[PDB]
From a paper:
When building atomic models into weak and/or low-resolution density, a common strategy is to restrain their conformation to that of a higher resolution model of the same or similar sequence. When doing so, it is important to avoid over-restraining to the reference model in the face of disagreement with the experimental data. Here, two new such potentials are described: a Cartesian distance restraint derived from a recent generalization of common loss functions and a periodic torsion restraint based on a renormalization of the von Mises distribution. Further, their implementation as user-adjustable/switchable restraints in ISOLDE is described and their use in some real-world examples is demonstrated.
Manual checking and (where necessary) rebuilding of the reference model is often advisable, particularly for older models; in many cases the output from automatic rebuilding and re-refinement by PDB-REDO may be a better starting point than that downloaded directly from the wwPDB.
Residue numbers in the entry: 33 to 133, 135 to 194, 217 to 242, 264 to 349
Write the structure that this text describes.
């Protein structure tokens, strides 16, 4: 299953960094014989690294999941490492693409995005995998083109399960959906940004952002909600999202940082009350 020969036999590596995960850095690379641009995640070997490889491998091929192409077990700097070769997500991050629109971003488009993310979580939860770190850095597009596909990645905190772990994914969906609809995170629905958002959308968010994890919707309830299930019928209402993301771009790193912190807090064995 994992290739034991040198990854450089098959791939020409670059030093262009494409992203950073808890277990390793993500580099650009090129398949030596097809020329296809790909992404290489370098994981120094460990049980956590073996878990990530195992979980991403099982999830690879599922809807809206970044696909693994190859996995290599190599020696690097005298250390045993695992190299995950993934499809190159040349469209970049979800919210950067929205930010780079001027053009109308509609509530229907947010509903289609959320349905895509929910489809990925639905696949994972039906295979007893909870992601536990769904966040802007992990939501990527296959290309900069209009027909790009949104996919989830990074299984470094994934866990084979537990209703609590799955409810942390559902909380992530509510946070992402909140930002999708107004351009700032929930950490009420203030006017003017939320003035014209439908009642279905605000109802779904409140059901996902319950403080009590047992009160949060499951992914099945999420996918059956009319805002998701009937996402095509969702009003084409133009949102403030792109404009707000541009206006607040200097604070975007802080938004990502506190979401990362909130997600890590949900993963601790024992937390304060
Ligand atoms: O596992 C991860 N944890 C943290 C972030 C991340 N990005 C990736 C990743 C994977 C594949 N392609 C990319 C990628 C992202 N952004 C790009 C922008 C422009 C060109 C290529 C890009 C590739 C990123 C994986 C991970």
């Amino acid at each position: 299953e994992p290739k034991k020969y040198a990854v450089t036999d098959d791939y020409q590596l670059s030093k262009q960094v494409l992203g950073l995960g808890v277990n390793g850095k993500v580099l650009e690379c090129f398949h030596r014989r097809t020329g296809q641009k790909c992404a290489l995640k370098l994981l120094y070997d460990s049980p956590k690294a073996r878990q990530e490889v195992d979980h991403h491998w099982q999830a690879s091929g599922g809807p809206h999941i970044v696909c693994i192409l190859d996995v290599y077990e190599n020696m690097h700097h005298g250390k045993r490492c695992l190299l995950i070769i993934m499809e190159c997500m040349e469209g970049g991050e979800l919210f950067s693409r929205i930010q780079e629109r001027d053009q109308a971003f509609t509530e229907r488009e947010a509903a289609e995005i959320m349905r895509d993310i929910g489809t990925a979580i639905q696949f994972l939860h039906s295979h007893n995998i909870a992601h536990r770190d769904v966040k802007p850095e992990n939501l990527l597009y296959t290309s900069k083109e209009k027909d790009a596909v949104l996919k989830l990645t990074d299984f470094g905190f994934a866990k084979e399960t537990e209703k609590y772990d799955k409810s942390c994914d559902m909380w992530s969906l509510g946070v992402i959906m909140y930002i999708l609809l107004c351009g700032f995170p929930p950490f009420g629905f203030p006017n003017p940004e939320w003035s014209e958002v439908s009642e279905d959308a605000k109802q779904l968010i409140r059901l996902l952002l319950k403080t009590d994890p047992t009160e949060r919707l499951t992914i099945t309830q999420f996918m059956n909600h009319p805002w998701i299930n009937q996402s095509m019928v969702v009003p084409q209402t133009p949102l403030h999202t792109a404009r707000v993301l541009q206006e607040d771009k200097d604070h975007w790193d802080e938004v990502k940082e506190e979401m990362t912190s909130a997600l890590a807090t949900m993963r601790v064995d024992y937390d304060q009350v």
